[PDB]
Design a protein around this ligand. Sequence first.
Ligand SMILES: CCCCCCCC/C=C\CCCCCCCC(=O)O
Ligand SMILES: CCCCCCCC/C=C\CCCCCCCC(=O)O
Lengths: 158, 158
Amino acid sequence: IVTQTMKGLDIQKVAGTWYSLAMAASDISLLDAQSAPLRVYVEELKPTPEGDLEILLQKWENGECAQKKIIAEKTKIPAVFKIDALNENKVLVLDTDYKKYLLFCMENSAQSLACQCLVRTPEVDDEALEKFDKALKALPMHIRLSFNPTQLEEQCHI
Amino acid sequence: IVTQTMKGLDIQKVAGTWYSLAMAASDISLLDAQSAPLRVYVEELKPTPEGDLEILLQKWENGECAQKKIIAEKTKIPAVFKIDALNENKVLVLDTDYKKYLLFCMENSAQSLACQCLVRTPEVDDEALEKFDKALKALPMHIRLSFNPTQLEEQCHI
Ligand SMILES: CCCCCCCC/C=C\CCCCCCCC(=O)O
Ligand SMILES: CCCCCCCC/C=C\CCCCCCCC(=O)O
């Protein structure tokens, strides 16, 4: 929890478009409603030249699908990034083939936890979903969501 | 969908106390919020002497955890029951050992679908959860919830 990170990660190679195909969290309230705190839909990853990672996403806030831009700073571990605000909050990359799928988790350091299966394409990748499910049997997840290709082409999935 | 029913079911032997340990549905909106349509927490099963099955449950309605009593009428198939209202709505018993776990699904006949893993006890039965997960890989589920022992002893899980 979480003791699965990607060895040999080249962060530059994750740049580009991603779809949040499936989400899971340790507590139901983290993903329950459209405005739940960790219900965030990844749009694009943009690594900076110094190795930080800026993230474009959508979040439902106040009855509307809002755009967000957040910055995840590099640490000494290539697969681990930190986000300010307030509580120390780390992003861990568990696995990726760069070209098709990426699995990551977000945990508050230090209890609470959310993971996603990102895919390059608005398609149900059964095989990325299988790897996501395997990575999660090691974790105490209590809500799990997945989306279909129609919803994946909509803002806030929708 | 759903093509898994329990052979040899003795409905009388499912009477008694049950806990809704985990829930899954084909559409996110079926389980999303506390007031979602299929977010129902089983309390007790009471088979009638003629083989019908009355169900006591809780549902969050209008900012409160309400008690419900619904009747599921027997069909020609021992593992399949029907509920009036409005849309023909069947309950199917997939598997049970009577003493520990029961898996069932509710489907609108005929599209939409929700399944639960019921347990006799406010304990996480990993082995019933495994069987639930196996029964579901055959199904198009897009939301899955589970509850911990604390929540299981609360009204509306809570
Ligand atoms: C390298 C894998 C990609 C990682 C993408 C990480 C996703 C974004 C991480 C955390 C977002 C947490 C929710 C914050 C939403 C913005 C502020 C808020 O509304 O609370
Ligand atoms: C034999 C296995 C036990 C089956 C228990 C079935 C659970 C109850 C079945 C369907 C309930 C569907 C929701 C209806 C809630 C009451 C009316 C409403 O608020 O819409």
